[PDB]
């Protein structure tokens, strides 16, 4: 029984932090196959309740030399397994602004986007230096080579409820990264690590369900947190600086789980539990 079986997940790839060919990249499962069962049982399962399980310990292949950090997350992928459309660049498989010249939202998959998500974070990691400890990234939109949105969850080894946070980061060159607090903080951060925050009391547990949307609509970027019961937290961001609308910059979503510490224990962990997850596109989502 794995997450395929009740997720319908063709439109998304995998990637698992275990490195299967010695090549030094971590495996990557295609849309196919990731539809019709995969499972890792370190890794990627489906829980009792419906869950789809994405696990990421500290120690473990990389994607690729461009990154420093493991991860157990999926990539959008609008061409749903037809490899005769690129998986890079301004294609089917991917989507762009409606901000973006019209020629290229005639080559895309999609305008404009909406990722939204529910889920658990089960588990942080509780060991590392201590601006990297307790980190880990839920949901993303990136592009060509920067990243429009990363999402954090971070819990404080010492603290019982848990901060959430964004980076929006304009291509380089387009200006500074900008990081936006929703609930509690990001610190310590590697800026001043002698920072010491109290537990934030709007916080999120470990194991408590919550849900977020991340939407990207022209240039505006709007992050929402979801709480049954309470009122939901937002935050706007304007893009229009940040060059993503440029002819040539196509986007996509990720979602998992991409573990931000590697410094801790090899076998310390993140990992959350997604009961639903949905990617749109076009005016009509």
């Given at each position: 029984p794995a997450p395929g079986?009740?997720?319908?997940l063709s439109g998304w790839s995998l990637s698992v932090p275990v490195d299967s060919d010695n090549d030094g990249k971590a495996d990557q499962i295609k849309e196919k196959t990731l539809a019709a069962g995969?499972?890792?049982?370190?890794?990627?399962?489906?829980?009792?309740?419906?869950?789809?399980?994405?696990?990421?310990?500290i120690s473990g292949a990389k994607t690729s030399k461009n990154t420093t950090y493991t991860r157990s997350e999926l990539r959008e992928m609008l061409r749903k397994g037809d490899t005769s459309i690129?998986?890079?660049?301004?294609?089917?498989?991917?989507?762009?602004?409606?901000?973006?010249?019209?020629?290229?939202?005639?080559?895309?998959?999609?305008?404009?986007?909406?990722?939204?998500?529910?889920?658990?974070?089960?588990?942080?990691?509780?060991?590392?230096?201590?601006?990297?400890?307790?980190?880990?990234?839920?949901?993303?939109?990136?592009?060509?080579?920067?990243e429009p949105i990363r999402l954090y969850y971070r819990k404080l080894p010492h603290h019982q409820?848990?901060?959430?946070?964004?980076?929006h980061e304009p291509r380089k060159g387009f200006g500074d990264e900008q990081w936006y607090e929703m609930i509690g903080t990001l610190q310590p951060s590697h800026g001043n690590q002698t920072?010491?925050?109290?537990?934030?009391?709007?916080?999120?547990?470990?194991?408590?369900?919550?849900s977020y949307?991340?939407?990207?609509?022209?240039?505006?970027?709007?992050?929402?947190?979801?709480?049954?019961?309470?009122?939901?937290?937002?935050?706007?961001?304007?893009?229009?600086?940040?060059?993503?609308?440029?002819?040539?910059?196509?986007?996509?979503?990720?979602?998992?789980?991409y573990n931000q510490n590697k410094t801790g224990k090899p076998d310390d962990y993140v990992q959350a539990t997604f009961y639903r997850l949905?990617?749109?596109?076009?005016?009509q989502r």
């Amino acid at each position: 029984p794995a997450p395929g079986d009740k997720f319908e997940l063709s439109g998304w790839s995998l990637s698992v932090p275990v490195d299967s060919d010695n090549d030094g990249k971590a495996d990557q499962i295609k849309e196919k196959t990731l539809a019709a069962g995969y499972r890792n049982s370190d890794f990627f399962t489906l829980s009792d309740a419906g869950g789809m399980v994405f696990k990421a310990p500290i120690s473990g292949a990389k994607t690729s030399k461009n990154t420093t950090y493991t991860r157990s997350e999926l990539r959008e992928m609008l061409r749903k397994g037809d490899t005769s459309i690129a998986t890079q660049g301004v294609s089917r498989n991917n989507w762009v602004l409606s901000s973006a010249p019209l020629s290229e939202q005639k080559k895309a998959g999609g305008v404009d986007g909406t990722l939204e998500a529910t889920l658990s974070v089960d588990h942080v990691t509780t060991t590392g230096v201590n601006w990297q400890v307790g980190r880990v990234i839920i949901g993303q939109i990136h592009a060509n080579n920067d990243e429009p949105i990363r999402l954090y969850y971070r819990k404080l080894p010492h603290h019982q409820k848990g901060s959430v946070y964004f980076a929006h980061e304009p291509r380089k060159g387009f200006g500074d990264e900008q990081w936006y607090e929703m609930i509690g903080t990001l610190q310590p951060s590697h800026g001043n690590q002698t920072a010491a925050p109290t537990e934030p009391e709007a916080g999120i547990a470990l194991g408590e369900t919550f849900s977020y949307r991340i939407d990207a609509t022209g240039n505006k970027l709007t992050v929402t947190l979801m709480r049954e019961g309470r009122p939901d937290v937002v935050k706007t961001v304007d893009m229009s600086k940040s060059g993503y609308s440029e002819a040539g910059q196509y986007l996509y979503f990720k979602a998992g789980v991409y573990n931000q510490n590697k410094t801790g224990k090899p076998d310390d962990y993140v990992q959350a539990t997604f009961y639903r997850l949905k990617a749109t596109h076009g005016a009509q989502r």
